[PDB]
Amino acid sequence: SGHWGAWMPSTISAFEGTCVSIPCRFDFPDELRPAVVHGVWYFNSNYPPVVFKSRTQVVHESFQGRSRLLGDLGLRNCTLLLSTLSPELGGKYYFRGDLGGYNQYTFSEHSVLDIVNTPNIVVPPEVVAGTEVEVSCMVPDNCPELRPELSWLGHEGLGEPTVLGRLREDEGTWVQVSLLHFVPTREANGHRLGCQAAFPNTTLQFEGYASLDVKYPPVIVEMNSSVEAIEGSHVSLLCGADSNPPPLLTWMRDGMVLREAVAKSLYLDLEEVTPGEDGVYACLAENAYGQDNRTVELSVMYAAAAH
Ligand SMILES: *[C@@H]1O[C@H](CO)[C@@H](O[C@@H]2O[C@H](CO)[C@@H](O[C@@H]3O[C@H](CO[C@H]4O[C@H](CO)[C@@H](O)[C@H](O)[C@@H]4O)[C@@H](O)[C@H](O)[C@@H]3O)[C@H](O)[C@H]2NC(C)=O)[C@H](O)[C@H]1NC(C)=O
Ligand SMILES: *[C@@H]1O[C@H](CO)[C@@H](O)[C@H](O)[C@H]1NC(C)=O
Ligand SMILES: *[C@@H]1O[C@H](CO)[C@@H](O)[C@H](O)[C@H]1NC(C)=O
Ligand SMILES: *[C@@H]1O[C@H](CO)[C@@H](O)[C@H](O)[C@H]1NC(C)=O
Ligand SMILES: *[C@H]1O[C@H](CO)[C@@H](O)[C@H](O)[C@@H]1O
């Protein structure tokens, strides 16, 4: 139609020290035919500073030499270019139309600018060993003058990355996405995943890091061999298990629980050990992703000396 209104991405992101182009289109009643279209861009911070003002060419000091209007206002194109970004410039940007006389219109729709300094690494909330896992590095690509070069850090045993390239997201903005597809093992637990966004012809370089929390079933690593004890002596049986999260350890005999605790290792203490304590003892390691069990035989085969 021919009505008052604007169109711009509600949210948009860009790296610190780079630039950002905020795509903008506005509309007005055709009946006016002003032949001269003026406009004003405001920043979020009762008395908002002026980013751009076509009539008086006035610019707030925080935007001087950093703000430039791309596209013709006469073509209903209010696209804004912001250069040499700094955290201070993070906030809401809204546009105001000026068609002379009483025809000034501050449009409702605005754009939130998020200035970042680290790439976005996306890891699924639950990484389990033995399952194919996708990990992505996302980076804003809304700067026409400076294109980010995406790269991974510390991804040796995770396979070679697959670059998706420039992808469109909602509200008509752009991102750079790189992928990692791999089946992690228990060894991949605690793996440092790093992503780097570098800009050629500049000294700008941004790095982000994340640690892989890889879940895996218990594997009993510490277990006593065949125990041959002296009569009346003290016997300590130790059972250690490696799992993520830490397992529930349980010492059992004759289908009866002797000791039980949520830990990496668990001791079973036997005092004044008699031949009646002979038999097979079992340690059970169990968590949310599996279980493991080991048995040990206890033999009181050494007679106690007189003392
Ligand atoms: C409102 O005004 C905006 C600004 O005036 C308009 O945005 C511009 O739209 C034009 C299309 O007419 C774009 O020009 C194109 O640019 C691409 C650049 O891609 C290549 O170049 C980069 C670096 O140079 C390179 O890294 C890439 O790999 C590509 O090879 C060219 O490929 C095209 O041939 C064409 O020249 C402007 O780039 C674009 N500017 C911005 C800031 O977005 C907008 O379209 C206007 N809106 C409407 C509705 O007309
Ligand atoms: C980046 O390249 C432009 C021209 O492509 C050049 O004018 C500018 O000096 C370069 N930046 C740096 C930091 O050298
Ligand atoms: C079982 O192994 C643990 C750790 O190696 C040790 O401390 C403990 O004494 C062993 N048990 C016996 C009965 O030797
Ligand atoms: C102990 O682990 C073995 C794996 O070989 C499994 O077959 C068995 O059912 C387990 N026993 C118990 C009581 O969970
Ligand atoms: C703009 O001005 C008002 C809206 O505030 C209406 O008369 C009409 O929508 C026009 O486009």
Numbering used by the authors: 19 to 63, 68 to 329
Kindly provide excerpts from the paper associated with this entry.
MAG is a type 1 single-pass transmembrane protein expressed on myelinating oligodendrocytes in the CNS and Schwann cells in the PNS23. Myelin-associated glycoprotein (MAG) adhesion and signalling at the myelin–axon interface regulates the formation and maintenance of myelinated axons, thus playing an important role in the development and function of the nervous system. MAG adhesion maintains the myelin–axon spacing (periaxonal diameter) by interacting with specific neuronal gangliosides (glycolipids), such as the major brain gangliosides GT1b and GD1a. On the basis of the primary sequence its extracellular region is predicted to consist of five Ig domains; an N-terminal V-type Ig domain that is typical for Siglecs and four C2-type Ig domains.
For the soaked crystals, diffraction data was collected to 2.3 Å resolution. The crystals were isomorphous to the unsoaked MAG1–3 crystals and a Fo(soaked)−Fo(unsoaked) map revealed clear electron density in the oligosaccharide binding site for one of the two MAG1–3 chains in the asymmetric unit. Most likely the other chain remained unliganded due to occlusion of the binding site by crystal packing. Y65 in the CC′ loop forms extensive Van der Waals' contacts with the ligand as well as a hydrogen bond to the O9 of the Neu5Ac sialic acid. Ligand interaction of MAG is similar to the sialic acid recognition of other Siglec family members.
